[PDB]
Design a protein around this ligand. Structure first.
Ligand SMILES: CCC1=C(C)/C(=C/C2=NC(=C\c3[nH]c(/C=C4\NC(=O)[C@H](C)[C@H]4CC)c(C)c3CCC(=O)O)/C(CCC(=O)O)=C2C)NC1=O
Ligand SMILES: CCC1=C(C)/C(=C/C2=NC(=C\c3[nH]c(/C=C4\NC(=O)[C@H](C)[C@H]4CC)c(C)c3CCC(=O)O)/C(CCC(=O)O)=C2C)NC1=O
Ligand SMILES: CCC1=C(C)/C(=C/C2=NC(=C\c3[nH]c(/C=C4\NC(=O)[C@H](C)[C@H]4CC)c(C)c3CCC(=O)O)/C(CCC(=O)O)=C2C)NC1=O
Ligand SMILES: CCC1=C(C)/C(=C/C2=NC(=C\c3[nH]c(/C=C4\NC(=O)[C@H](C)[C@H]4CC)c(C)c3CCC(=O)O)/C(CCC(=O)O)=C2C)NC1=O
Ligand SMILES: CCC1=C(C)/C(=C/C2=NC(=C\c3[nH]c(/C=C4\NC(=O)[C@H](C)[C@H]4CC)c(C)c3CCC(=O)O)/C(CCC(=O)O)=C2C)NC1=O
Ligand SMILES: CCC1=C(C)/C(=C/C2=NC(=C\c3[nH]c(/C=C4\NC(=O)[C@H](C)[C@H]4CC)c(C)c3CCC(=O)O)/C(CCC(=O)O)=C2C)NC1=O
Ligand SMILES: CCC1=C(C)/C(=C/C2=NC(=C\c3[nH]c(/C=C4\NC(=O)[C@H](C)[C@H]4CC)c(C)c3CCC(=O)O)/C(CCC(=O)O)=C2C)NC1=O
Ligand SMILES: CCC1=C(C)/C(=C/C2=NC(=C\c3[nH]c(/C=C4\NC(=O)[C@H](C)[C@H]4CC)c(C)c3CCC(=O)O)/C(CCC(=O)O)=C2C)NC1=O
Ligand SMILES: CCC1=C(C)/C(=C/C2=NC(=C\c3[nH]c(/C=C4\NC(=O)[C@H](C)[C@H]4CC)c(C)c3CCC(=O)O)/C(CCC(=O)O)=C2C)NC1=O
Ligand SMILES: CCC1=C(C)/C(=C/C2=NC(=C\c3[nH]c(/C=C4\NC(=O)[C@H](C)[C@H]4CC)c(C)c3CCC(=O)O)/C(CCC(=O)O)=C2C)NC1=O
Lengths: 172, 160, 228, 162, 162, 172, 162, 172, 160
């Protein structure tokens, strides 16, 4: 549970001194691009149900063993729980790119859900591939311009793909 | 080990240990603490390594557990997990010794002749050590995973 | 009365929404709202006793708390508090266990969920000694989770213990978490000598498996699944 | 898994007591039920494939738009028809499973518990499945008390749908 | 009041659902039970007074000290015999009530729930009541499945006593 | 938490097909003998307090170290808890032979109580011998026919002794 | 373990405060008690074996049926007498332990907490132990305030029994 | 949770016999010196806030790294928690010397707090030195006479220093 | 065995085997069938012999299983039954060989020094072999019980 600003504050307090000037110029540029970070976050957020349905749509086209009887996502209840797990992961990705820090995504999902999927018998590979495909579709949905003033979103595609790869690797 | 190899390599040459070999032995002597930490990491969690690696192996190569394969049945699968336990033990020995002469000098010389006399596919054994390497390097930090994966890498390389 | 240090919540079955209809392995719910009989009140009282401290002896039972409960003056969460601050529960649970172990046990029983991490039990363990067990029980009962899942007159229970269409759910907190820890066991000197077993535990030394034999790994070879 | 013997054991366990005559009454009743229900489940097993095709054709008949419009939720293409007769056979198999188990437990654990959010996410109308279950409960061809309790399970699925 | 229909309604209410086929299985089983149990309860009603006197005489026979020693808990005087055949008739009446109700509920609510503390406070040995219930379950003279479930209720009272 | 019927249903669903005919004939024979299963269950249930008192009676005659001071079942409170543990084990045996499946006995006792008796310092050997003696007395009480129409209980002695041996081995 | 110093520490701990003058008042009172109670416990230790045999003989005298009838709960055989004078000595030892500890804690933890269910399961009448404790409290032969508080502990055991 | 008397009672019950005479003479001498023990306790108790403030005063003069930014007791909240931890340790020392047994001090602090300080990142060395200095100051405050009748204070210096060293070693 | 003893006893004397020793070897050669039958009787029922003999021993000598004794605890009682299994195995060897030189030459020479170094009462071990003899001679016919009790007798005699 950290912001960008609280991250700089905690680092400056662990140093024990005041915040240096270059960190303040970095935070000024962050305050200039923080809206830039988040209009996209808004265009990521508005299409979330389409994102998770298309992600499960491609995943269960890709691995039909999960839909097959005896598969892990075969049962209707389990399949609803699977879509719930995916939607939760997407929501915490949107939270982490809202606050601009991966510590919220770590705190809320990562440390426990790997052991949860081991204990449940859930294959971590399929949900890892699903989070990867969902992240690819999310950047693909975010990057296109349909009536928005053009801007360079290069570091925020960088950051969003970082968050999605962190989620997919912590899932394993 | 490192000291055995340096002593023998200076021993054939009828010379003492060169100073470069001596700081090699010194650096291995200093890194022995991290080697012992990797060895405790590999030793304490051997149950989960052998179990998960056998599970991923039989998922990956199901024909050796199907009727017709070598490791078909209860006792044959138990002997298969025992052979994987042997190779993880040799991995721990090679991690401590700092060189692969325990692993090679115990369980890699006539491995092709033995597994041909038993009727075993050696590629499936290489896949077993590959899954053991995946579970083991999924269990450690970065440099620890690299240092253990060097010896796992040597075992899979000495298979094929 | 400094605030608790913040702690991570780990992933658990309670954390998700969950999509379950009324199944068997869903635990039975006991509210005072749907029960009015002398009978039904006795059944509810025994259910609360079972949940708070596995078995309740006749001396263990509190005539005051049950007697107040049948009128309606006392709500079932106040009955839970009366069981928690009861002296026999303190004696069986708080005195024998360690402080962190006690916080773990009581969080399991009252909230119905396992503690998220050791850091959460460490965070909660300070309230006990700084303010007394009564103030800790007061701080534990009025949280968001207890008020959201049970409330005023629902007997607490283990939440989403067993999953839908599963053979084995989870271990019940009653059998899983005993009354005292291993330290109090060491205080009793409790590992007892049993010679009458070692007659029947004795197998011939030829039959005992050794380090070259594959009979040690046979349990793993029969516990692992092999696809057809 | 709400089956009568399981829930009797759950009652006796939550009460903390032994089994009484109540559970034995439950048992002679359950055996009375199963004594026809097992043969009725075998008869449904026999007529299953034709019932599935007839239900799919009745569903295409009452809702002809699903065969026409392009859409991956609709059964316009062939894969929609494969998947959709697959879930017809799923519904019929759950009906037979509840006929064997003697309670609504198997359909409640395999179908009902997530069907609402699945039909919400996938743009599937539940009325299609209601029409199919109505065709099945009309055309199963059983008779007597087995037919009435089969219709009971199918009507339970209908009420759980909408 | 653990009777089968009451506990079926309690299950369906605590689950929050309607009634299913499980409760109807419980019901045809309960009617099967009552179809002999009501006539067996009437037969016990007929033989009740002689059974009460025979149980009291068997209790005085096996425990002859209770007739001899002075003590208000013992039935040495006449008021002890009046009160004590009164609680014999109490036990028999609760047996008939559980035969009508179809479950152990009436004895559990009228006898069992406080009997331990009462026998503790009043210096009454429960073995006296165990001997009386054993004499009743030997001498009730029923036959068949009604006799077996009558013996079930009496054995339940015995196990609740000691 | 499984029946016999739910066990066949879960196996047939994991197979993904309908129930085969031979399983239905097996379940028909089970429905014919399920009452037969039951008669032993009711005559087992009615004598339960006598069973646990005779079992503890023979056990504490057999191992007087438990009654001896410092013994594990020496204290009055601990001795009452010991009789409670035994009665619980007998009750879950009766539940498992009611439902006709050992999964209820596994679910409710077995996986935790071995670790519980290790952590408590309870000797697993004495309670294992007590469950064995209780099971021997239970089959001995069930098998005698007193005022019962003659019938064959042979399979069900098999099943009850199976449940008791599973309990005694899971205790250890 | 309800002993005065332990419960004073429990009060001060549950309140979350340090020790006050209240606990020191408890302490000078406890030392005043122990200053005679330890010597009285030693005197009971001296007279213990004859008190145990006298209590067993008084129990056989008031309840002569227990020596006569065959039954493993009754002390008709010799092993019944060994076990039963053993639990006489158990009761006397718990009395001495509470005399040393200064509170009813040891008897409450070693005797009282399960005695009701044990006497229920084993067909032991608690009145036998009441008679034995009455004989002990009559025949212990102490004098003064030590005798009064010894009688207090024995009467506490009697009230906990019945 | 044991007294001196309950300790002798539990030992005599594990022996299974009555209490021997020499233990009763020992307990009589304990009852004679128990007031001794606890006047000592009362003059320890009355100066407790001065004891913990002087202990933290010498400790943070001694190790200025804890006060330094990034130190473990640097933050105001953490420093208040540090004084709270010290006051708790002193209070349980006073409880253990009240009841005359170290089992209360063991029960309430020792088994968990070592692992707590490991998990928190708390240096066990500084709090060990602080408990040692607090114990030295506590015996120094207890031993001096200011208007009190002469008494055999010394054995009880033995016991109090034992309790403080047990606390400091269990902390580590 | 008998043949070893006769060969050695003629060997020190610098002579051949005397004809009386030769019919001794001949009679042992003919009685080998009954010796093998006694050996199968002792081998096939070793579980019940060890179990019942341990039960009767701990009934007879309860102090060695009480806290303070040698065989106190789970693993100590298991080692005690293992030592009894060793002695029953040596009894079977001595039954087959026709003489006590297997029993003496394996497990009776330094038995006092070993059991004194372990802290074991040797009289309780003699009671263990006594209960083993009781269960074993309760298991056979008359002459078979006498022939097995000769070797059991030698073991208890060599204890004390
Ligand atoms: C806030 C963070 C958080 C996470 C991440 C979380 C995961 C989580 N996923 C679960 C189940 C599940 N999760 C999945 C998901 C999948 N399985 C598959 O087959 C696919 C590989 C994948 C779909 C992407 C499925 C199918 C289950 C159901 C297992 C079951 O019900 O038996 C469960 C078990 C309890 C339950 O769902 O109702 C938890 C706790 N819970 C949380 O509270
Ligand atoms: C919470 C409601 C809300 C929204 C949604 C919002 C969005 C928003 N995005 C803006 C700008 C912008 N937004 C973008 C975003 C992008 N351009 C690209 O080519 C990328 C693909 C993409 C990022 C991934 C850019 C490039 C600008 C240019 C102006 C600026 O830097 O703000 C601005 C500047 C002011 C204006 O447009 O009138 C607004 C209002 N403002 C609000 O108050
Ligand atoms: C420390 C060096 C070392 C090794 C490696 C070793 C192997 C070894 N493996 C054996 C058998 C075996 N090992 C396997 C193992 C496998 N088959 C498969 O399909 C899998 C791919 C694979 C294991 C994952 C099987 C199936 C047998 C039994 C062969 C047979 O029964 O014919 C045997 C014969 C039985 C025995 O005595 O164990 C030896 C000696 N011994 C050694 O000292
Ligand atoms: C065992 C109980 C069970 C049920 C009921 C079940 C239903 C189910 N039907 C699905 C899709 C579907 N369901 C339908 C069905 C229809 N659409 C129509 O137009 C017809 C009116 C109707 C034919 C019956 C179709 C065509 C799909 C594929 C559409 C999709 O991509 O999601 C899916 C999503 C999986 C997928 O996308 O392939 C589930 C989970 N699954 C289960 O495990
Ligand atoms: C409807 C269920 C029900 C039961 C079972 C019941 C038992 C019951 N029996 C009582 C007394 C008694 N119970 C007995 C019975 C006996 N003593 C003997 O010696 C004989 C062996 C045995 C004859 C059966 C006697 C003689 C009394 C009067 C003793 C008394 O003052 O307490 C009392 C105390 C009331 C009183 O003192 O008059 C109760 C409550 N009450 C109930 O409401
Ligand atoms: C529903 C399944 C379930 C089981 C099985 C269970 C066992 C269980 N037995 C316990 C204690 C016990 N269990 C025993 C039983 C025995 N010890 C002996 O000496 C004998 C070997 C044996 C008698 C057969 C005893 C004596 C205790 C008391 C330990 C104590 O209070 O310190 C405890 C500790 C808490 C307490 O009793 O009050 C648990 C949780 N609890 C459960 O909820
Ligand atoms: C809960 C009240 C209740 C009871 C008590 C009950 C018992 C009961 N046992 C029955 C059968 C039977 N019961 C037995 C039992 C045995 N035969 C032996 O020789 C064995 C020793 C013994 C088992 C150990 C047998 C063999 C049958 C034959 C019929 C059948 O298989 O059910 C039947 C079949 C229907 C009938 O007899 O009218 C009933 C009613 N039914 C009830 O509703
Ligand atoms: C330290 C506190 C303590 C007490 C009080 C205690 C009582 C106690 N008495 C018992 C039995 C017994 N209690 C008695 C006593 C009597 N019966 C008579 O007829 C006489 C009137 C009376 C003689 C005093 C007898 C004879 C037994 C053996 C009966 C049995 O099998 O259960 C048993 C069951 C153990 C067993 O069966 O051997 C317990 C637990 N145990 C304890 O640990
Ligand atoms: C009843 C027995 C009991 C003990 C012993 C106990 C210790 C305890 N000390 C804690 C923290 C602490 N304890 C210390 C103490 C110290 N750290 C230092 O730097 C010094 C070496 C030392 C001062 C002597 C500090 C600074 C913290 C704060 C850690 C934090 O808040 O992040 C915490 C974490 C939760 C919190 O304080 O608010 C616990 C549980 N809690 C208990 O309930
Ligand atoms: C809770 C309120 C309270 C207090 C404070 C209290 C103290 C107290 N301390 C006493 C004795 C005493 N107290 C001390 C203490 C000491 N002498 C030394 O020289 C040492 C340095 C020091 C111990 C470190 C001594 C030596 C005695 C002698 C009498 C005795 O043994 O009690 C006595 C005996 C009776 C009396 O003095 O009238 C009292 C009252 N009593 C109370 O009720």
């Amino acid at each position: 549970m950290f912001d960008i600003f609280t991250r700089v504050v905690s680092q400056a307090d662990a140093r024990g001194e005041f915040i240096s000037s270059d960190k303040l110029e970095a935070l000024k540029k962050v305050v200039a691009e923080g809206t830039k970070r988040s209009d996209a976050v808004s265009r990521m957020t508005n299409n979330a149900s389409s994102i998770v349905t298309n992600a499960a749509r491609q995943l269960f086209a890709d691995q039909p063993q999960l839909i097959a009887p005896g598969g892990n996502a075969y049962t209707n209840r389990r399949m609803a729980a699977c879509l719930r797990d995916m939607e939760i992961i997407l929501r915490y990705v949107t939270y982490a790119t809202f606050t601009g820090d991966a510590s919220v995504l770590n705190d809320r999902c990562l440390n426990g859900l790997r052991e949860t999927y081991v204990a449940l018998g859930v294959p971590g590979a399929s949900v890892a591939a699903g989070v990867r495909a969902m992240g690819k579709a999310a950047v693909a949905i975010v990057m296109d311009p349909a009536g928005v003033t053009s801007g360079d979103c290069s570091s925020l595609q960088q950051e969003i793909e970082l968050y999605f790869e962190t989620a997919a690797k912590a899932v394993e | 080990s490192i000291v055995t190899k340096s002593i023998v390599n200076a021993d054939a040459e009828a010379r003492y240990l060169s100073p470069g070999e001596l700081d090699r032995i010194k650096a291995f002597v200093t890194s022995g603490e991290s080697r012992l930490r990797i060895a405790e990491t590999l030793t304490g969690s051997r149950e989960r390594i052998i179990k998960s690696a056998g599970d991923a192996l039989f998922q990956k190569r199901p024909d050796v557990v199907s009727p017709g394969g070598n490791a078909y049945g209860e006792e044959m699968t138990a002997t298969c997990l025992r052979d994987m336990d042997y190779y993880l033990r040799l991995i721990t020995y090679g991690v401590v010794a700092g060189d692969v002469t325990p692993i090679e000098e115990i369980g890699l010389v006539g491995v092709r002749e033995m597994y041909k006399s038993l009727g075993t596919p050696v590629d499936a054994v290489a896949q077993a050590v590959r899954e053991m390497k995946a579970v083991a390097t999924g269990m450690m930090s970065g440099d620890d995973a690299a240092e253990a994966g060097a010896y796992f890498d040597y075992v899979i390389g000495a298979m094929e | 009365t400094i605030p608790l240090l913040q702690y991570a919540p780990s992933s658990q079955n309670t954390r998700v929404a969950g999509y379950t209809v009324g199944g068997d392995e869903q635990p039975f719910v006991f509210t005072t709202d749907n029960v009015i009989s002398d009978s039904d009140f006795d059944v509810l009282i025994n259910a609360a006793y079972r949940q708070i401290f596995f078995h309740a002896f006749k001396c263990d039972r509190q005539q005051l708390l049950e007697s107040q409960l049948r009128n309606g003056q006392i709500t079932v969460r106040d009955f839970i508090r009366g069981l928690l601050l009861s002296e026999t529960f303190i004696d069986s649970f708080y005195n024998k266990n360690s402080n962190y172990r006690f916080v773990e046990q009581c969080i399991q029983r009252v909230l119905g969920r396992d503690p998220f991490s050791e850091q959460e039990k460490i965070a909660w363990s300070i309230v006990i000694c700084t303010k007394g067990l009564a103030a800790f029980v007061d701080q534990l009962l009025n949280t968001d989770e207890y008020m959201e899942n049970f409330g005023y007159d629902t007997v607490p229970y283990q939440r989403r213990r067993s999953l839908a269409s599963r053979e084995q759910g989870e271990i019940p907190f009653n059998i899983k978490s005993p009354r005292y820890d291993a330290y109090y066991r060491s205080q009793l000197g409790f590992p007892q000598v049993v010679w009458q077993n070692a007659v029947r535990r004795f197998r011939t030394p030829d039959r005992v498996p050794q380090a070259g034999d594959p009979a040690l790994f046979l349990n793993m070879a029969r516990s692992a699944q092999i696809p057809k | 898994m709400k089956t009568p013997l399981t829930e009797a054991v759950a009652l006796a366990d939550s009460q903390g007591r032994f089994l009484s005559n109540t559970e034995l009454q439950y048992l002679y009743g359950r055996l009375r039920q199963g004594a026809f229900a097992l043969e009725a489940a075998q008869t449904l097993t026999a007529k299953a494939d034709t019932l599935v095709n007839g239900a799919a054709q009745a569903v295409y008949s009452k809702f002809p738009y699903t065969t026409s419009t392009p859409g991956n939720n609709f059964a316009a293409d062939q894969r929609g028809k494969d998947k959709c007769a697959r879930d017809i056979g799923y519904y019929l198999r759950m009906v037979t499973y509840c006929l064997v188990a003697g309670g609504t437990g198997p359909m409640d654990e395999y179908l009902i518990a997530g069907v609402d959010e699945i039909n919400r996410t996938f743009d599937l109308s539940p009325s299609w499945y209601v029409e199919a279950l109505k065709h099945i409960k009309a055309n199963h061809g059983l008779t007597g008390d087995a037919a009435t309790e089969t219709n009971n399970y199918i009507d339970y699925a209908i009420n759980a749908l909408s």
